[PDB]
């Protein structure tokens, strides 16, 4: 499934991401655009033996289990397959646990490089 930006911004608001841990809705919308390009089926394999799954590109070494990554920790307690769903619930719940770590939203490389310190409100404007 490929979301529209206003379509995703409304889905993220109904899942409780607006101001979650002091992070406004626009930050979450901007992150999904530069991580997956609004695609729920997005899966990026890395040279280190791990893979990033779904709309929020969740890593298989620290957060989800794919039974293919050596040294896996599964801190989100879920299979990586659940994060490839058209229902964003599983991806949102794992993202809530991730951002609660010391890295905050910087855990998302594309958010730090393209969203952090910009006018994130523009992503939820006109919806």
């Amino acid at each position: 499934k490929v979301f529209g930006r206003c379509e995703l911004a409304a889905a993220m608001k109904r899942h409780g991401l607006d101001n979650y841990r002091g992070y406004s809705l626009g930050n979450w919308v901007c992150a999904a655009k530069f991580e997956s390009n609004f695609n729920t089926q997005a899966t990026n394999r890395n040279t280190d033996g791990s893979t990033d799954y779904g709309i929020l590109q969740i890593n298989s070494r620290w957060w989800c289990n794919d039974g293919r990554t050596p040294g896996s920790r599964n801190l989100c307690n879920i299979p990586c397959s659940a994060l490839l769903s058209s229902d964003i619930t599983a991806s949102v719940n794992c993202a809530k646990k991730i951002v609660s770590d010391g890295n905050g939203m910087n855990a998302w490389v594309a958010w730090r490089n393209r969203c952090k310190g910009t006018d994130v409100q523009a992503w939820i404007r006109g919806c």
Partner: antibody
Framework: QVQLVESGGGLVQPGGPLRLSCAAS????????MSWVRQAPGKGLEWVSA???????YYADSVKGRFTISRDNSKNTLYLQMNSLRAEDTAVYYC???????????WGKGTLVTVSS | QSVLTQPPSVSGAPGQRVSISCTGR?????????VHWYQQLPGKAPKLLIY???NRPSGVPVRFSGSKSGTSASLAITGLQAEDEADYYC???????????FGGGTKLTVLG
């Protein structure tokens, strides 16, 4: 227009505290990503702490547990509380305004902190 | 040991092209985090020279350029001159240490 003036720097004994201030004018602290960066005499730059526009706070490992960053919207001022200071903490302390991707767009003049007996 | 590594010194003649390297780790540059560069004149606070990996802010001449691939980053200066003499620092973010990080710095001498 954009200004950052730091105060509270001076001499302190080892194991003692010190509180730094940073008064802003020409912009709003509550709407920006702010940080503290230090530089020891004749040494390199060291990142210390950061406060996000949403209210989130982050710290370097060398200062973790001892230091605390805060803000006051009524006075538009950034603070840095320093406890159990040692000789390695002697440095010029800079107040900084971040642009995109934690790049520093504007810097204060810096205040000197000397930890000696 | 060292989080971001730069050579302590570099030197070139006026008009010569020179480069300054910035070696990183799998937790910072190699993790996908962008590199920024700063120029520090003596008795002054640093000033942003390169943001992103290649972008120049207004006022920074075209003779200054940046490059970044894999675990390394580089700052190139073509047509070296007197005013280029300063300390240069690279900067990134480290996801293991959870924070922004600076290189040790490089002193650039213009000999001639």
């Amino acid at each position: 227009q954009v200004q950052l003036v730091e105060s509270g720097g001076g001499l302190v004994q080892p194991g003692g505290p010190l509180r730094l201030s940073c008064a802003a004018s020409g912009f709003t602290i509550s709407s920006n990503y702010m940080s503290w960066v230090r530089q020891a005499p004749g040494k390199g730059l060291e990142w210390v702490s950061a406060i996000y526009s949403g209210g989130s706070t982050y710290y370097a490992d060398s200062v973790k547990g001892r230091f605390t960053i805060s803000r006051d919207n009524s006075k538009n001022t950034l603070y840095l509380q320093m406890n159990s200071l040692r000789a390695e903490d002697t440095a010029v302390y800079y107040c900084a305004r971040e642009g995109p991707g934690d790049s520093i767009v504007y810097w204060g003049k810096g205040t000197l902190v000397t930890v000696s007996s | 040991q060292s989080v971001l590594t730069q050579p302590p010194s570099v030197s070139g003649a006026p008009g010569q092209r020179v480069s300054i390297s910035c070696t990183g780790r799998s937790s910072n540059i190699g993790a996908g985090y962008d590199v920024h560069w700063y120029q520090q004149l003596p008795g002054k606070a640093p000033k942003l020279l390169i943001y992103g990996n290649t972008n120049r802010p207004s006022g920074v001449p075209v003779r200054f350029s940046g490059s970044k691939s894999g675990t390394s980053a580089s700052l190139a200066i073509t047509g070296l001159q007197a005013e280029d003499e300063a300390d240069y620092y690279c900067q990134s973010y480290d996801s293991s240490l959870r924070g922004s990080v600076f290189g040790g710095g490089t002193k650039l001498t213009v000999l001639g």
